Amino acid sequence: MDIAGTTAFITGGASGIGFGIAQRLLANGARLVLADIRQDHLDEARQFFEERQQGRNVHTIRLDVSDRAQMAEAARECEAVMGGPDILINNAGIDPSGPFKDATYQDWDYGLAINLMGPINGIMAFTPGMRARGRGGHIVNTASLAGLTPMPSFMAIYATAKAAVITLTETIRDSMAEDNIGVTVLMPGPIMEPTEVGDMIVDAIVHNKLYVSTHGNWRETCEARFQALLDSMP
Amino acid sequence: MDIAGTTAFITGGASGIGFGIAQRLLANGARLVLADIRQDHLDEARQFFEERQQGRNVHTIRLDVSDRAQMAEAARECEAVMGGPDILINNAGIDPSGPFKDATYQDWDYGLAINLMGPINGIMAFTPGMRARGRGGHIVNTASLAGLTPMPSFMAIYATAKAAVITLTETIRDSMAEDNIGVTVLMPGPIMEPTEVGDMIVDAIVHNKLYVSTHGNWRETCEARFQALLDSMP
């Protein structure tokens, strides 16, 4: 899809990959709504754009992506203030990792709430409008290569959630396509510069690419896992 | 591990795959605790074994695997009544499929609660004892080939949950290994006789196999997905 003239709503938008994506979407003609849990991060992020004389095209919303009522409110605020959005970037995450025997129900609940239910809540809250407005759109979900390559037990919660996000994104593709909404799952490793990731995401939105991986260092470990899965099949 | 003289706790144990696993574990010398949400199913399953003079080796518990308090109760009752368990089969599932546009938060919460949090709750409630008793054990989680091969959007919730269970099982392996507890993820297709699946699980427990797939029909479709993932990697 064409990025020019669109509005992008970006969770975890005040730092890291989310902020790199923000920069490159704005550079390609999008207006921005940055959502994040930290007030100070959001103000710093908009100040960056302020210094580049683009403050009027960036709005910020303090948001907990696990709060479904807040997510619905944010979708209405986005539409009112900046329009749309046409582009939804579900990028917020957290890392609940630690010795697996020390893991608690609270770790599981929080880990899944942000990393898995965040994107689900975004899809639930934003797609009714994205479908109804009828001008297409795009959804990017940030997963991780930790959702694909074999991971150790101290990363069980994170890996489990991010694997789910990969399959979620794959599986909703046909449903979203009915209303000309493309989907992409972003699978980072160690974050390469955020604006480089941003440009990969620009390409994925423009050309409707399902998969974006930032690194290839786990090609062989992934291949080995994939082969073991295949070998299990009679 | 040797199955003879062990106790197996099996969720969704009163029908389908769970009951086939129950049958073959008992045939290999395990005592059984069958857990299921349906009391009438449990009664029928109990009767089946009673008529084959195996009644005193089977115990039934009505259980909602998404209820953590009930799961804690079940672990206490299992240990008291039948001992152990040495073998934990997290097999309960449900399918909230339907047009993805019409999916509700309730569909997602139910789908994830049973299919993903069920096994997590089983692990959390049962593995402390399995570790403490110090005689090792085995955990089988029932996922699905739907968690691996590309699925249509109307199956998004099920596919998402089952993909997560595959990764859950992979990642916890090294933690469970510390206490000589092996793990297996079972990935079924269309259910082939349940007892045939049961024998695959006997083999997995005896030989500590990480993966069991019941069908080879999705080899090529999985290969294509895996290749697309690999191709995304720089």
Residue numbers in the entry:
A (entry chain A), B (entry chain B): 1 to 191, 229 to 271
Question: What does the study report here?
Answer:
A cellular pathway has been characterized that performs β-aryl ether (β-ether)3 bond cleavage using three sequential Lig enzymes. The first step in the Lig pathway is a stereospecific oxidation of the benzylic alcohol in the GGE substrate to produce β-(2-methoxyphenoxy)-γ-hydroxypropiovanillone (MPHPV), which is catalyzed by nicotinamide adenine dinucleotide (NAD+)-dependent Cα-dehydrogenases LigD, LigL, LigN, and LigO. The final step consists of a GSH-dependent lyase, LigG, that catalyzes the elimination of the GSH thioether linkage in (βR)-GS-HPV to produce glutathione disulfide (GSSG) and γ-hydroxypropiovanillone (HPV). Our structural and biochemical studies of the enzymes in the bacterial β-aryl ether cleavage pathway reveal the features important for substrate and cofactor binding and catalysis by these Lig enzymes.
The LigD and LigO enzymes catalyze the oxidation of the (αR)-substrates (αR,βR)-GGE and (αR,βS)-GGE, whereas LigL and LigN are specific for the α(S)-configured substrates (αS,βR)-GGE and (αS,βS)-GGE. We have solved the crystal structures of LigD, LigO, and LigL, which by amino acid sequence alignment belong to the short chain dehydrogenase/reductase (SDR) superfamily of enzymes. LigD, LigO, and LigL are classified as classical SDR members that have a core structure of ∼300 residues and share the 11TGXXXGX(G/A)18 sequence motif at the cofactor binding site and the catalytic tetrad N115-S144-Y158-K162 (LigL numbering). The superposition of the LigD, LigO, and LigL structures using Cα atoms shows a root mean square deviation for LigD-LigO of 0.88 Å, for LigD-LigL of 0.70 Å, and for LigO-LigL of 0.93 Å, indicating that the enzymes display similar overall structural features. In these alignments, the most sequence-divergent region is in the predicted substrate binding loop. This proposed substrate binding region is disordered in all of the crystal structures solved in the apo-form (LigD, LigO, and LigL) and in the structures of the LigD·NADH and LigO·NADH complexes. However, in the structures of the binary complex of LigL·NADH and the ternary complex structure of LigL·NADH·(αS,βR)-GGE, this region is well ordered, suggesting that this is a flexible loop that undergoes a major conformational change upon cosubstrate binding to the enzyme.
